[PDB]
Every structure is written in C-alpha cells, then in structure tokens.
Amino acid sequence: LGQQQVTLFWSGAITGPTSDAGAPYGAAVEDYCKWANERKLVPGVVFNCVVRDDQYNNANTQRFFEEAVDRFKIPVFLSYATGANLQLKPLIQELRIPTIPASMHIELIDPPNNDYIFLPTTSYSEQVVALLEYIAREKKGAKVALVVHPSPFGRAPVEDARKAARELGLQIVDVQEVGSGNLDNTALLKRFEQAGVEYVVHQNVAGPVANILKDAKRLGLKMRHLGAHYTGGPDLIALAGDAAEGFLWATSFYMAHEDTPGIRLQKEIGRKYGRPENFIESVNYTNGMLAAAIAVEAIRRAQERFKRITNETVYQAIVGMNGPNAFKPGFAVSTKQGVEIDFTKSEHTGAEGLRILEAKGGRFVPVTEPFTSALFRKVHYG
C-alpha cells in the first residue's frame, strides 16, 4: 500500500579481470534501474539500485550476495562471473532466488541446483558449436585451435567444442589459455602456424583477443579468427582496429546500427545519463540492459498478478513469460519461428537464437539469419 522500496542488485567486474565487458554491463543495469524510477515502469515501486564491483573475485561476490539477501531482501539476483555463479548454485537453489547471469555458461542451467537460474541468451557452448558448424561448411577437415580465457569462463565451452569438432570432422589441434596482459602472442601464433592451424576460435573478453589479432596482422598470417559473445562488437573494433577485419562473431544481440525500439532506448538512456559514446554502443551495455529489463519486467508482472514482490512471485512471473506473454524488448534476435525472451519451468534460456556476424570496414555485419544449433543439443543433451 503506497510506494515500496525494491532492491535491484548486481555484482560483477566493473574493474579487474573481464572488465571490458563488466564495466558497460554494470553501467547498463544502473542506468536502466534509474530509468525505471523516472518513467515509473512499475507503479508503486521505487528501485534501490545496488551495483557492486566484485572485481571477478568470487569471495567478494559471495559476501555481496549474502549482504544483499540478508539486508536488502532481494527477490532477484543479477549476477556476473561463471566461476562465481558455479560456486553460488547450491545457495541460490536453497534460498530459491531467481538469478539472471551475464555468464552464458550452459552448466548453470544444468542439474543439480538449476531451478532458479535463467540465461537471457544462448550459451557459450551453442555459440562455439555454431561457429564450428560455420567452419565445417567452409572447409572440411579444417584444423582449428581454441584460445580461451584462463578461468571457468574461458573453459566453459571447451568440452562441447571437442565433441562437436569430432562430429563435424574437424580437428582441434591445441587449446591455449590467454589472459589480459598478453602483449606478445608471437610464440603462440608461430606454434599454430607450424601445426597448420587455419581457424582460431576465441572464448574471451575483447582485450586479449585484440592483442592476438594485432600480432596476427603484424606477422601476416592467414588463419581466420572467430569468437563467442564476449569477444566482439564495437569494443573489439576499438581495441583491434583493422586487425579485426573479417573476424567472425557469434551473438544473440542486435547491433547498434540496426533498427529496434530496444537499441533506440539504449541510446536514449545512455545519452540521458551522459555515458561515453563507447559505452552507449557496446554490445555489453545492450547485454546489461536486457538483464535489468528482464528483472524489472518480472517485478512488474509480479505486482500486477500478486500485488506483492518476492522471490516466489518473481519466479512465477518469469516461468509464465512465454507464448503471447513473452517479453519482447527488442534487445536480442528471435527465430522466424520463435519469440525474443521466453522462459518456462523447463526452458531456462531466453533468446534461444543467435547469428554469426562478420566485421567489415569497422562494423559487425550479420552474415546469417537467427538460428539455433541442433548440433549443440546433440553433443550436449545426447
């Protein structure tokens, strides 16, 4: 009765490892929550916006989550790191709070302790398998190398890739872990060239990838580079410049240059709060805005249906978010079959479609229609 306070809490890497993505992501959550208040998107609710920088340290994330459950009574958890989410799964499950991660690791929505975790988009695995499919269409028996961030995040899609490579007749000849501060990748690239690698697939944030491309260009190599969600967009172009030309990127998001109410809104909100241009255009600002938008829309549905806002009512709002009752903010693509954001008790992936985009003269251009990977489902679910 009257205005109530509701806490929207995100914990992730505004600084520290992976912060190329966590900074714009965190910023979008804070901004959207700010916009929810100004436009009164949820009648009778003022959002208390809590955005914590855990710097990719799982102990910081746990402490911030415990504080947020105990003190702020959160009905939802906007989370970040793969490693952190893996570690908190038992506790998330125990206290039944719906959790929407920036991490797209499929293991998060696999048993046990998976009833409350909802992936806004396709997983690292589907992305990587989608890219491998694209590789096998180009060139049979292609030699491919994986380069991966040194963490549970980098390692996430490695097993689905090996088994997909096997199914497609490709050979994964190496897998290397490369983190930030990779000033000189000469040795690694020379190793790949000796072994006849022809395609390098990346699972990383954009700074390590950019460094590798810069060196690749410098040395004049012919291997093609591809990458999953966090590797690309305008961020990669800004760090790699022309060394990005021809990079192939798998993602569920619309680009900054496409026409969508959601992309339009990201721009409007970004300018409103004076974000720098490169935040406004980041695909990760889009990514955070979708996560906060999902949370804010489930809170709204909870208010309309139950007139009470709890982990339980918010849960019920999310698992009813399907069919004609799906959420279509225009942030991510949809299959010509499907809708944009839809969940059920048994379907925990929001935007199940993705595309492959190619970097051309400084901009990522779609070279596919939205699609789902049946190959991913065979190798992963059997």
Binding site for ligand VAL (CB under 6 A): 18, 21, 80-82, 102-103, 105, 153, 205, 230
Return the number of the residue (247 or 254) whose C-beta is nearest a second copy: 247
| Element spanning 121, H or E | strand 119-121
Binding partner selected for residue 153 from a second copy, ligand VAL, Na ion, none, CB under the kind-specific 5 to 8 Å limit: ligand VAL
Total site size for a second copy, rule CB under 8 A: 25
| Binding flag, residue 342, Na ion (CB under 5 A) | yes
Q: How many residues does the chain have?
A: 382
N- to C-terminal Cα separation, the chain: 50
Binding partner selected for residue 313 from a second copy, Na ion, ligand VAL, none, CB under the kind-specific 5 to 8 Å limit: none
- Which residue of 6, 23, 255, 289 would you call a contact of a second copy, by CB under 8 A? 23
Site for a second copy in 190-229 (CB under 8 A): 214
Token reading at 184: 């000189």
Return the number of the residue (192 or 253) whose C-beta is nearest ligand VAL: 253
DSSP string, 65-132: HHHHHHTT--S-EEE--HHHHHHHHHHHHHHT--EEES---GGGGSSSS-TTB-EEE--HHHHHHHHH
Binding partner selected for residue 366 from Na ion, a second copy, ligand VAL, none, CB under the kind-specific 5 to 8 Å limit: none
Report which DSSP code applies to 254.
Answer: P
Q: How far apart are CA 295 and CA 282, in angstroms?
A: 20
Q: What are the backbone dihedrals phi and psi of residue 80, each rounded to the nearest 5 degrees, phi first?
A: -135, -85
Q: How far apart are CA 211 and CA 256, in angstroms?
A: 24
CB of 194 to a second copy, least distance (A): 24
| Binding flag, residue 352, Na ion (CB under 5 A) | yes
Q: Are 117 and 187 in contact (CB under 8 A)?
A: no
CB of 100 to Na ion, least distance (A): 13
Q: Are 122 and 349 in contact (CB under 8 A)?
A: yes
Return the number of the residue (52 or 143) whose C-beta is nearest a second copy: 52
| Binding flag, residue 59, a second copy (CB under 8 A) | yes
Residue ranges binding a second copy (CB under 8 A) = 14-17, 23, 27, 53, 55-57, 59-60, 181, 183-184, 214, 238-241, 273-276, 279
